[PDB]
């Protein structure tokens, strides 16, 4: 049986602050610029609709130069860092970005039709844009976050399923890697292997997996390592109502309509889809620039950062403003000409993560050792890397630690609270 | 006279948690896919506008392997499970879906007409869509939920009523079966037997009954078995204003207008109808992912789950995102062509129901036996199935029970509250 980590871990009055100086990432908002024929990316895709997961690294307290280690006995106990407070700072001004597809699959605006739709003549794709769903969610944990998405499974029939038949829906768990895309109102799904048209969805997520944090699974996890604190403030609506083009995969049952004549004799496509909207973004609705205290983590893991690791997932579409960036080819021309200017899109993202840690000690009794081993043997192996598979924003705080909370803003806020 | 169940049922400190692992249902959002000529459904209709009523089954405490039954005397009393806490977990990301009719009956946009409407020339139906009313309602009870809807009654006249005359309005009670459709802003009515056009309403509810929970009847029920706790957070508005086509069933009185001339001489149809809208969906407006404590059920039935049954009705249009699913007939073509891709719509629904139960004991005095018999003799017959008529999501928790609340998230939340 799992036990509240507190039941055996003791807390101390030795507090420390550590936070990045100024994280900054700049890149194209839609797709990763690269070279004409390489997989050498030249400018990364930096969009506000990405899970900026920071794999923070903490110094090992057992090998840390404390001023005097009389507070704990190394001969019988070890040390770990417990996350008491987190502040996800944000510097860039609030503003919702934009994305679109030059050839989004959109037959007609079925929102309000004055006359019946005309014939769907070969490739009626359109240059359409939209402002994506608003999302603000912060996750703090020690195990990597686990999201979700709809992938491809085994089809209903096993007849070497017919070309273009139903792609079966499967619910697939996966670790949310840094740079992955948040659900944008089109549903959490792997468009890459689930939508061939390559036109159902805007460009910036067309060939990426829209993952969503599996809050149920993470909360029901036995040890609750994935997250012990979180928030979510996502919202949107149907800005517009559109229709998909293409041959009907599932024809409307004939008991589900009376046959038409003439122009209406052609049943128009019923494959409707919505266009999301990142509605009001305001300071009052701001998750960030606030200190969250994890003193009462739901999880059995009450903030203990096993392995000197912290996973801080941050989603912020309330600062996803994509700003243009035109550069003049030549100023020798006295009159404006459209082709004289090259168009560039670059989204600026700024992060400044801050933390407060309370030192803890673990007494190595036989029962405590057995429990910790069963929980995660890799923890014992550290005192007495499986994450290479996933890409994270590698953030090192091993030298950023300081014992003077009063000097830093988060430390002062924690002092005033504590 | 009915008596508060507490007046004779005693509570115990023996608590238990039990909840599904991960419920999941996937299917077409509009209509049930089937075979070309059968009533063999191939893919069920899974839409976010459906009453997902779960008929939970609980283990019988009288035949349950408790660690030691010294707490109660089987020779004179029995046991029942009382529902103390419920958490309707939701995993899928929030997002409002969409539905529409290829031939919705819509003459013209009477919202703002620049010129008088033209002639209504045979089958002016249109391909129109809409985003349905937003609804979030959870009902917890022991008897099955009872909704309402407008059906067909006996007409005003009994002359073998003339073809196409008034279909009389009748208010009809009925048990809300799993898969039934919630009111979507078009009113609670049985379109199947009340709208012959088959075009007044979008496809996904065109041939289904729009039921609404009869809160008044359920609350005024003598024993209050149908529900002892509920919530409702539904809202919408008129996105657009439209007009119906067809011959006028009820001609406008002549004292109710001055006759026109020329183009306006033709009185346009006055059969106006609104197009609903599922306005802002947000985390702040979330019923779910929260624990509701039924300690103060209004009902005389204070959560007692007679018959080891629980009926959990869940409506969630704030996660009704319909996601497409294009499949490729053949990649042999280098250029896009509309007919090369088949269109599919599949809506993913994920549920994770959790509960806390407090064990109770019933002392079999003569008066108590008589009262319970009069209330529901079937209860006594269990100690010393009429629901086969209705389809429910049969959810079995008989083996999911556990006495360790601390291990599960709802159990921990209940511990912190209690």
């Amino acid at each position, epitope marked *: 049986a799992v036990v509240s980590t507190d039941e055996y871990v003791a807390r101390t009055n030795i507090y420390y602050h550590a936070g990045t100086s100024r994280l900054l990432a700049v890149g194209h908002p839609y797709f990763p610029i690269k070279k004409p024929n390489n997989n050498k990316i030249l400018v990364p895709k930096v969009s506000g609709l990405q899970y900026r997961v920071f794999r923070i690294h903490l110094p090992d307290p057992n090998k840390f130069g404390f001023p005097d280690t009389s507070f704990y006995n190394p001969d019988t106990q070890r040390l770990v860092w417990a996350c008491v407070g987190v502040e996800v700072g944000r510097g860039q001004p609030l503003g919702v970005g934009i994305s679109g597809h030059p050839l989004l699959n959109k037959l007609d605006d079925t929102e309000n039709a004055s006359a019946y739709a005309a014939n769907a003549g070969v490739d009626n794709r359109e240059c359409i844009s939209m402002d994506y769903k608003q999302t603000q969610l912060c996750l703090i944990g020690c195990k990597p976050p686990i999201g979700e998405h709809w992938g491809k499974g085994s089809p209903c029939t*096993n007849v070497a399923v017919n070309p273009g038949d139903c792609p079966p829906l499967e619910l697939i768990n996966t670790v949310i890697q840094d740079g992955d895309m948040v659900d944008t109102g089109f549903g959490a799904m792997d468009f890459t292997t689930l939508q061939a048209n390559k036109s159902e969805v805007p460009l910036d997520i067309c060939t990426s997996i829209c993952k969503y944090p599996d809050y149920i699974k993470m909360v029901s996890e036995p040890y609750g390592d994935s997250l012990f604190f979180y928030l979510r403030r996502e919202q949107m609506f149907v800005r517009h109502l559109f229709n998909r083009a293409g041959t009907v*995969g599932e*024809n409307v049952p*004939d008991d589900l309509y009376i*046959k*038409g004549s003439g122009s209406t004799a052609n049943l128009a496509s019923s494959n409707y889809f919505p266009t999301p909207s990142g509605s009001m973004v305001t300071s009052d609705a701001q998750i960030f620039n606030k200190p969250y205290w994890l003193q009462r983590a739901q999880g059995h893991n009450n903030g203990i950062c096993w392995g000197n690791q912290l996973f801080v997932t941050v989603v912020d579409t309330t600062r996803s403003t994509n700003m243009s960036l035109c550069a003049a080819i030549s100023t020798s021309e006295t009159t404006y000409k459209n082709t004289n200017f090259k168009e560039y899109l670059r989204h600026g993202e700024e992060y400044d993560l801050q933390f407060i840690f309370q030192l803890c000690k673990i007494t190595l009794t036989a029962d405590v050792m057995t429990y910790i081993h069963s929980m995660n043997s890799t923890i014992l192996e550290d005192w007495n890397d499986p994450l290479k598979k996933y890409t994270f924003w590698e953030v090192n705080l091993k030298e950023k630690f300081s014992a003077d909370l009063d000097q830093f803003p988060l430390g002062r806020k924690f002092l005033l609270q504590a | 006279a009915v008596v508060s169940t507490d007046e004779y049922v005693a509570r115990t400190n023996i608590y238990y948690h039990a909840g599904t692992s991960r419920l999941l249902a996937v299917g077409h959002p509009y209509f049930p896919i089937k075979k070309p*000529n059968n009533n063999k459904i191939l893919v069920p209709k899974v839409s976010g506008l459906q009453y997902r009523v779960f008929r939970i089954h609980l283990p019988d405490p009288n035949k349950f392997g408790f660690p030691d039954t010294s707490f109660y005397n089987p020779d004179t009393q029995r046991l029942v499970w009382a529902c103390v806490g419920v958490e309707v977990g939701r995993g899928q990301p929030l997002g409002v879906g969409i539905s529409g009719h290829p031939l919705l009956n819509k003459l013209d946009d009477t919202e703002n007409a620049s010129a008088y409407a033209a002639n209504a020339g045979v089958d002016n139906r249109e391909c129109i869509s809409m985003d349905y009313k937003q609804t979030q309602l959870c009902l917890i009870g022991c008897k099955p939920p009872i909704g309402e809807h407008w059906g067909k009654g006996s007409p005003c006249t009994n002359v073998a009523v003339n073809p196409g005359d008034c279909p009389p309005l009748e208010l009809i009670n009925t048990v809300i079966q799993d898969g039934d459709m919630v009111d979507t802003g078009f009113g609670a009515m049985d379109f199947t037997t009340l709208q012959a056009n088959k075009s007044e309403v979008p496809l996904d509810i065109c041939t289904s009954i729009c039921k609404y929970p009869d809160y008044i009847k359920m609350v005024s029920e003598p024993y209050g078995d149908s529900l002892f706790f509920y919530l409702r957070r539904e809202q919408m508005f008129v996105r657009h204003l439209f007009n119906r086509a067809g011959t006028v069933g009820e001609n406008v009185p002549d004292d109710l207008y001055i006759k026109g001339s020329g183009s306006t001489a033709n009185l346009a149809s006055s059969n106006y109808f609104p197009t609903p809208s599922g306005s802002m969906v947000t985390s702040d407006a979330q019923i779910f992912n929260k624990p509701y404590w039924l300690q103060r059920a209004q009902g005389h039935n204070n959560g007692i789950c007679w018959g080891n049954q629980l009926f959990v009705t869940v409506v969630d249009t704030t996660r009704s995102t319909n996601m497409s699913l294009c499949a490729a*007939i053949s990649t042999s073509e280098t250029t896009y062509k509309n*007919t090369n891709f088949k269109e599919y719509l599949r809506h993913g629904e994920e549920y994770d129901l959790q509960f806390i139960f407090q064990l109770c004991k019933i002392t079999l005095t003569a008066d108590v036996m008589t009262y319970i018999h009069s209330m529901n003799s079937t209860i006594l017959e269990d100690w010393n199935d009429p629901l086969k008529k209705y389809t429910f999501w049969e959810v079995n928790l008989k083996e999911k029970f556990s006495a360790d609340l601390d291990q599960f998230p709802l159990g921990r939340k209940f511990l912190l509250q209690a």
Partner: antibody
Amino acid sequence: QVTLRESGPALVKPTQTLTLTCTISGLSLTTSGVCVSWIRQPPGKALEWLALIDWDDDKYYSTSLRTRLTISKDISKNQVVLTMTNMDPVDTATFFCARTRCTSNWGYYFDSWGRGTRVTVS
Amino acid sequence: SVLTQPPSVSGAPGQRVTISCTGSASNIGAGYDVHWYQQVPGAAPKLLIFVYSNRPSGVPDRISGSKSGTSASLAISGLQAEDEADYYCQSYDDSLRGWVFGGGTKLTVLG
């Protein structure tokens, strides 16, 4: 490859019973999603679908000839049996058993066709 | 037949000829796929088009089709001697409850 070879009486007389029989190879009738149809073509006339059978034993027939038609399949022989009752002289036509793939849309199709066998009623 | 086709069309080598199959709201209007079959007389039919303007395996890349209104088309560009065959459109019908074929256009390659 999927191969179909028809067999039956090339000559029949009126008011008799006709039993065609199409053999399938390279494919199993037990596999889910497999279907096979029969399509007859009178001399110099357009094709006319007759019946469809699938893995789920679900059967379809042309409405005009529904009262005369019954189809089945034998897993042991990997076989499809078609029976037409009360043969008329005008039924003379070539009969093709074609592997129907049963796509999601009710516009099914016949991916592969057999050699075809002439049936003459006189 | 519920579906309709021109009884005969002709085209000299190197020309493009379209065989149009027109249905009704019951079969092609509902959205049921249109399939074209090339049949050399006296032999078994062959699958030529699998969905509107879709090419099966082993079919020459010059053959195609289209979907337009309640009708479909079979465009054979760059005609050749091999195109001396009949063609049948095929779909599903809602009044018949069964699968139907067209009138069997008899394409001929002119001298």
